[PDB]
Amino acid sequence: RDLPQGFSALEPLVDLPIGINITRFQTLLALHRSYLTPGDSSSGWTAGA
Amino acid sequence: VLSFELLHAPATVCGPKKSTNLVKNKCVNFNFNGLTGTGVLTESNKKFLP
């Protein structure tokens, strides 16, 4: 738990000339489906740490 | 028909590709990707980051 104590700089990966406007933000994770939680997206899903 | 579009959008790919060989150890007028100048070009033992 909690972020470590140290310094580390971040290198560039990619620049894109798309030029669209961005104002919001949302993220995607994994929703397990198995015998434990069956059904659709409304009932059959566990989170995962 | 190959047609172009004109608007305020930023630029994109094109057709420079200015290719000229490399001469070293001489006073030459050079123009790299975007930076220009004059001087003598030689070999260095300095290491950049990729």
Curated annotation (Swiss-Prot), chain A:
<feature type="glycosylation site" description="N-linked (GlcNAc...) (high mannose) asparagine; by host">
    <location>
        <position position="21"/>
    </location>
</feature>
<protein>
    <recommendedName>
        <fullName>Spike protein S1</fullName>
    </recommendedName>
</protein>
<feature type="region of interest" description="Disordered">
    <location>
        <begin position="33"/>
        <end position="49"/>
    </location>
</feature>
<comment type="function">
    <text>Attaches the virion to the cell membrane by interacting with host receptor, initiating the infection. The major receptor is host ACE2. When S2/S2' has been cleaved, binding to the receptor triggers direct fusion at the cell membrane. When S2/S2' has not been cleaved, binding to the receptor results in internalization of the virus by endocytosis using host TFRC and GRM2 and leading to fusion of the virion membrane with the host endosomal membrane. Alternatively, may use NRP1/NRP2 and integrin as entry receptors.</text>
</comment>
<comment type="subunit">
    <text>Binds to host ACE2. RBD also interacts with the N-linked glycan on 'Asn-90' of ACE2. Cleavage of S generates a polybasic C-terminal sequence on S1 that binds to host Neuropilin-1 (NRP1) and Neuropilin-2 (NRP2) receptors. Interacts with host integrin alpha-5/beta-1 (ITGA5:ITGB1) and with ACE2 in complex with integrin alpha-5/beta-1 (ITGA5:ITGB1). May interact via cytoplasmic c-terminus with M protein. May interact (via N-terminus) with host bilirubin and biliverdin, thereby preventing antibody binding to the SARS-CoV-2 spike NTD via an allosteric mechanism.</text>
</comment>
